[PDB]
């Protein structure tokens, strides 16, 4: 069991949103908290062993230290990984303008065949939300209902856990458009 | 390492174990708990300081007697009053032939009270669920894991890592509302009650949106009428489906008139309308409430 088992990565197919790419999801690399501890460096290496170019992190300096992975971003830095920090409040949802950057950058990476991996702490909340959003974002035909099942298929029936997340998903398309204010 | 006798594992939930044991002297029972820090750990274990506290301030019949505690630096242990098994066990080991309609009430009743006792001390249990309700040979039922027990007015706070069970959460908390009340505990029991009855857990949850909908699909998609002020509840949405109440006729037929009105009120949407712990211990339903002794 645990910590010395190589770091898992759930590869989500983006074909049903008509993309050939795959997006990757995992839990905090190196996380040491509640019945969960690991080796940052080692996990971090396995990723590079795994082929990872770009990495999207949704924690917060606040969280990186609380899980004892302060330098995480750096270990990523000096490991060949282009990291994109996009903290999302814990137990929260991103503001549309932030959530928007994520979709963009994320999309680009894929458009440009980059081995992209995303994560927050638990990988069952924030990251599922964000991945679910990219589905609604690469397709105007896919239903919130569906994208959810997509992640549930990927990560378990505990996919989008919260209700705030569920609501957020059903309103992403609107709020995203409502970001119509080209300005 | 302490004059004692670890014999059997009565339990082991969320980072911790609850071995059974005897006084390495005159024996005389024991439900010795256990919890672990190891120093160089996150802010000491809170699991407990407050839980040992509230356990002290609280001293009532239907409330586990925290006999003692051994503060050892290595790992912290809490001597508890051993008590055979919890209600999940019992409930389970009875789910085919059911539980005695009386023993049920004898059990619910001793609970409402013990509950209303804490409530009266300005406390919310919050972790009410079968595995946390203990029973004994004579038909006596106590409360436990005051591990999430806090004093009135604690706010609802959610964490990415804090991913719990939910089977027993009340609609006001799922729909998002700063802080919670005692109405919550009178809802966990709502469920738990209708579960000793029908034998199967009332609303099984995997995601908050499922937890709800189940409830709504069973208890009707609440409208302003039954619950003044929903359509304003942070995470409410006109969009959710609108399931018309699934009349008790399917919900708990094994019951009667009293039970079927209590539960009804015991699982009311409006927290401000949901019945009180004391207002419960009254109800005609508990009239001839004896203390059936169970068989295990
Ligand atoms: N005094 C006791 N007598 C009998 N069984 C007990 C006693 N105290 C604890 N248990 C058993 O231990 C478990 C409950 O322990 P406890 O409340 O410490 O657990 P927890 O993991 O901290 O909380 P939870 O069970 O709510 O996850 C149950 O399986 C219960 O049967
Ligand atoms: Mg318990």
Q: Residue B150 pairs with which residues in a beta bridge? A: B124
Residue B11 — left, alpha, or beta (φ > 0 → left; ψ -120 to 50 → alpha)?
A: beta
Residue B212 CA to residue B207 CA, distance in Å, equals 9
> Is there a binding annotation on residue B13?
yes
Q: Which residue reads 């039954």 in tokens?
A: B226
**CA-CA distance, B25 to B128, in Å (whole number)?**
35
- Write the CA distances from B207 to A166, B43, B167, B214, integer angstroms: 9, 30, 10, 11
Non-local (6+) Cβ contacts of B193 within 8 A are B104, B108, B263, B266
List of residues 6+ apart from B172 with CB closer than 8 A:
B180, B183, B184, B233, B269, B271
DSSP code of B148? G
Q: Which bin fits B122, alpha (ψ -120 to 50), beta or left (φ > 0)? A: left
Query: Is the same domain home to B196 and B122?
Result: yes
Verify that B115 and B182 share a domain, yes or no: yes
What whole-number distance in Å separates Cα of residue B82 and Cα of residue B20?
A: 7
Residue whose Cα lies nearest atom 1 of ligand 1: it is: B82
Nearest to B100 by CA among B286, B292, B283, B262: B292
**Cα-based distances in Å from A78 to A60, A106, A114, B194, B232:** 19, 21, 18, 58, 49
Length of chain A measured in residues: 183
State the DSSP code for B182.
Answer: T
Ligand 1 pocket: which of B21, B131, B143, B166 to mutate (most atoms <8 Å of CB)? Answer: B131
Residues B78 and B112 in one domain: no
∠ Cα A14 A15 A18 (to 5°): 100
**Distance between the two ends of chain A, CA-based, in angstroms?**
53
Query: Same domain for B260 and B212?
Result: yes
| Alpha-carbon gap, residue B140 to B134, rounded angstroms | 8
Q: Which domain holds residue A172?
A: 1-183
β-strands A116-119, A22-25 pairing = parallel
Which stretches of chain A sit within 8 Å of chain B by CB?
33-35, 66, 90-91, 120-122, 124-126, 157-164, 166-167, 170
CA-to-CA separations, B121 to A37, A58, A152, B54, B116, in angstroms, rounded: 39, 41, 43, 9, 9
Q: In whole angstroms, how far apart are CA B180 and each of A36, B62, B144, B211, B235?
A: 30, 23, 20, 18, 15
Domain match, B76 and B96 both:
no
Which of B34, B59, B84 is a domain's end point? B84
Question: Is B268 exposed, middle or buried (CB count within 10 Å of its CB: 0-12, 13-18, 19+)?
Answer: buried
Query: Residue B73 sits in a domain of what CATH number?
Result: 3.30.200.20
- Tokens at A152, concatenated: 């549930």
Residues from B contacting A (CB-CB < 8 Å) are: 15, 42, 157-163, 174-176, 206-209, 212, 235, 237, 239
Q: What is the rounded CA–CA span in Å between residue A119 and residue A112?
A: 20
Chain centroid to CA B115 = 10
Domain boundary among B84, B117, B135: B84
Q: In what order do the strands lie in the sheet with A22-25?
A: A10-13, A22-25, A116-119, A54-57, A82-85
* B172 vs B178: CA distance, rounded Å: 10
Instruction: Give the whole-angstrom CA distance, residue A26 versus residue A46.
Output: 12
Interface test with B, best of A2, A161, A165, A174 (most B CBs within 10 A): A161
What does the block give as tokens for A48?
Answer: 């590079």
Which letter does DSSP use for residue B147 in this model? G
CB-nearest to B209 from A34, A90, A166 is A166
Ramachandran area for residue A154 (φ above 0: left; ψ -120 to 50: alpha; else beta): alpha
Q: Quick check: A157 and B235 CB within 8 A?
A: no
Number of compact structural domains in chain B: 2
| Cα B111 from Cα B78, distance rounded (Å) | 23
**Same domain assignment for residues B258 and B124:** yes
What are the contacts of A10-15 at 24+ separation with CB within 8 A? A10/A123, A10/A154, A10/A155, A12/A131, A12/A150, A12/A151, A12/A154, A14/A110, A14/A134, A14/A135, A14/A138
Residue pair A14/A21 in contact by the 8 Å Cβ criterion: yes
The Cα–Cα gap between B269 and B190 comes to: 12
- B32, B119: one domain: no
Strands lying side by side in the sheet with B85-86: B85-86, B133-135, B141-143
Strand B75-76 with B123-124, pairing: unpaired
Between strands B85-86 and B133-135, the pairing is antiparallel
Structural domain boundaries, residue B228: 85-295
Please check whether residues B49 and B185 belong to one and the same domain.
no
In contact, B17 and B9? CB cutoff 8 Å: yes
Report the CATH number that the domain containing residue B150 is assigned in CATH.
1.10.510.10
Select from B183, B213, B212, B215 the least CA-distant residue to B202.
B215
Q: How many CB atoms lie within 10 A of CB B108?
A: 25
| CATH number, domain containing residue A22 | 3.90.190.10
**Pair A37, A99: CB distance under 8 Å:** no
Active-site residue set of B: 127
CB contact under 8 A, A166 and B207: yes
Which residues have a Cβ under 8 Å from the Cβ of A140 and sit 6 or more positions away?
A173
Same domain, B162 and B271: yes
Contact criterion met (CB below 8 Å) for A72 and A40: yes
Distance (Å, rounded) from C-alpha B180 to C-alpha B271? Answer: 9
What would the two tokens of residue B202 be?
């009332």
Q: Examine the domain organization and report whether B146 and B240 are in the same domain.
A: yes
Contact B209 A160 (CB under 8 A): yes
Which of B38, B62, B84 is a domain's end point?
B84
Indicate if B75 and B97 belong to the same structural domain.
no
Instruction: Establish whether B105 is an annotated binding residue.
Output: no
Domain tally for chain A?
Answer: 1
Token pair listed for B175: 């729909």
Instruction: State the first-to-last Cα distance of chain B, in angstroms, to the nearest integer.
Output: 34
Q: Please choose, from the candidates B7, B9, B10, the residue with its C-alpha nearest in 3D space to the C-alpha of residue B22.
A: B7
Same domain, B224 and B79: no
Paired with B142 in beta bridges are B134
Q: Are B191 and B202 in contact (CB under 8 A)?
A: yes
Concatenated DSSP letters for B6-57? Answer: ---EEE--SS--EE---BTTTB-------EE--SSSSSS-HHHHHHHHHHHH
Q: Which two tokens stand for residue B95?
A: 């789910």
Question: Left (φ > 0), alpha (ψ -120 to 50) or beta: where does B16 sit?
Answer: left
> Three-state SS string across B85-141, please?
EEHHHHHHCCCCCCCCHHHHHHHHHHHHHHHHHHHCCCEECCCCCHHHEEECCCCCE
Question: In Å, how far is A162's CA from the nearest CA of chain B?
Answer: 5
Resolution in A: 3.0
Q: How far apart are CA B240 and CA B222, in angstroms?
A: 10
């Amino acid at each position: 069991e645990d910590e010395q088992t190589p770091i898992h990565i759930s590869w989500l197919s983006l074909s049903r949103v008509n993309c050939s790419q795959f997006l990757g999801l995992c839990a905090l690399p190196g996380c040491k908290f509640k019945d969960v501890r690991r080796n940052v460096q080692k996990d971090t290496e396995e990723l590079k062993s795994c082929g990872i170019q770009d990495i999207f992190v949704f924690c917060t300096r606040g969280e990186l230290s609380k899980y004892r992975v302060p330098n995480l971003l750096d270990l990523y830095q000096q490991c060949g990984i282009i990291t994109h920090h996009h903290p999302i409040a814990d137990g929260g949802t991103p503001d549309i303008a932030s959530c928007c950057e994520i979709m963009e950058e994320l999309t680009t990476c894929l458009k440009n065949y980059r081995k992209t991996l995303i994560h927050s702490y638990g990988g069952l909340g924030r990251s599922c939300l964000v991945a679910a959003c990219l589905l609604l974002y690469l397709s105007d035909t896919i239903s919130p209902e569906q994208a959810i099942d997509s992640l549930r298929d990927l990560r378990g029936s505990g996919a989008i856990q919260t209700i705030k997340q569920y609501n957020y998903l059903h309103e992403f398309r609107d709020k995203l458009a409502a970001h119509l204010s080209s300005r | 390492m302490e004059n004692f006798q670890k014999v059997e594992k009565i339990g082991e939930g969320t980072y911790g174990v609850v071995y059974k044991a005897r006084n390495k002297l005159t024996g005389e029972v024991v439900a010795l708990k256990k919890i672990r820090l190891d120093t160089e750990t996150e802010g000491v274990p809170s699991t407990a300081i407050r839980e040992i506290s509230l356990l002290k301030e609280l001293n009532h019949p239907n409330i586990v007697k925290l006999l003692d505690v051994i503060h050892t630096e290595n790992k912290l242990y809490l001597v508890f009053e051993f008590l055979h098994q919890d209600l999940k066990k019992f409930m389970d080991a009875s789910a085919l032939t059911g539980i005695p309609l009386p023993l049920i009430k004898s059990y619910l009743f001793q609970l409402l009270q013990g509950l209303a006792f804490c409530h009266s001390h300005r406390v919310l249990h919050r972790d009410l669920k079968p595995q946390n309700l203990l029973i004994n040979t004579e038909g006596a039922i106590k409360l436990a894991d005051f591990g999430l027990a806090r004093a009135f007015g604690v706010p609802v706070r959610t964490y990415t890592h804090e991913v719990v069970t939910l089977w027993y959460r009340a609609p006001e908390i799922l729909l998002g509302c700063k802080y919670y009340s005692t109405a919550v505990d009178i809802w966990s029991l709502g469920c738990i009650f209708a579960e000793m009855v029908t034998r199967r857990a009332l609303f099984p949850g995997d995601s908050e949106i499922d937890q709800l909908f189940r409830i709504f699909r069973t208890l009707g998609t609440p409208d302003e009428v039954v619950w003044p002020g929903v359509t304003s509840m942070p995470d409410y949405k006109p969009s959710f489906p609108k399931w018309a109440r699934q009349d008790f006729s399917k919900v708990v037929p094994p019951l009667d008139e009293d039970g079927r009105s209590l539960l009804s009120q015991m699982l009311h949407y409006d927290p401000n309308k949901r019945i009180s712990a004391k207002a419960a211990l009254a109800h005609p339903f508990f009239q001839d409430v004896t203390k059936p002794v169970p068989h295990l």
